[PDB]
């Protein structure tokens, strides 16, 4: 699925799949982290279940940061699926800052990367995408705990 950009061998991030795209995406991933809010969702997250995909719904408002504890819980969940041999998709929508934040966090969490190097790696895979200052702050908090 070309919207998905992989950040390691098993974890990717992307924009939101449309409902017509679900059959395709569901054959490429085993689990999905949904970071959009319910007022951004054009379908029920049931549609993933009906296609054999397990879901973690961790809503974050657009342009804002998750809490650091919310971040760590999402990271632990991704790690669980990865350890099971599964491929995981992190998606948000819009400017992509929310999935960008979680993807940078994942590189710090799983590979031990510093924040500044994790930011550089995600930055190159998404030309023109930025994290807001609020998202930068929680990532710094994550670095200070990790």
Residue numbers in the entry: 2 to 147
What does the paper say about this structure?
Structural and biochemical analyses revealed that this structural alteration requires the presence of the GG motif in the P-loop, and that Tk-PTP has dual amino acids, Asp63 and Glu132, both functioning as the general acid/base residues. PTP proteins commonly share a highly conserved active site motif called the PTP signature motif, which is also present in Tk-PTP as HC93MGGLGR99. This motif, constituting the phosphate binding loop (or simply called P-loop), contains the catalytic cysteine residue (Cys93) that functions as a nucleophile for dephosphorylation and the conserved arginine residue (Arg99) that anchors the phosphate group of the substrate during the enzyme reaction.
The recombinant Tk-PTP protein expressed at 25°C in Escherichia coli was purified at room temperature using a Ni–NTA column and size-exclusion chromatography, which was subsequently subjected to crystallization trials at 18°C. Triangular prism-shaped crystals were obtained, which were used for determination of the crystal structure of Tk-PTP to a resolution of 1.7 Å, referred to as Tk-PTP(form I) in this manuscript. The asymmetric unit of the crystal (space group P212121) contains one molecule of Tk-PTP(form I), in which a central β-sheet constituted by five β-strands [β1(Lys6−Asp9), β2(Val12−Ser15), β3(Ala32−Val34), β4(Glu55−His58), and β5(Lys88−His92)] is sandwiched by four helices [α2(Val69−Glu85), α3(Gly98−Arg112), α4(Leu116−Lys126), and α5(Gln134−Arg146)] on one side, and by two helices [α1(Glu22−Asp29) and α+(Leu46−Arg52)] on the other. The overall structure indicated that Tk-PTP(form I) adopts the typical DUSP fold, composed of a core region (β1–β5 and α2–α5) and mid-domain variations (α1 and α+). Similarly, Tk-PTP(form I) adopts a distorted P-loop conformation in which the backbone amides of Gly95−Gly98 are oriented away from the active site pocket (left top). Structural alignment between the P-loops of Tk-PTP(form I) and DUSP3 bound to 2-(N-morpholino)-ethanesulfonic acid (commonly called MES) shows that the main chain backbone of the residues Met94−Leu97 of Tk-PTP(form I) are arranged differently from that of the corresponding residues of DUSP3. Furthermore, steric hindrance occurs between Tk-PTP(form I) and the DUSP3-bound phosphotyrosine-mimicking molecule in the superposed model, demonstrating that the active site motif of Tk-PTP(form I) is not suitable to accommodate a phosphotyrosine moiety; therefore, Tk-PTP(form I) should have limited phosphatase activity.
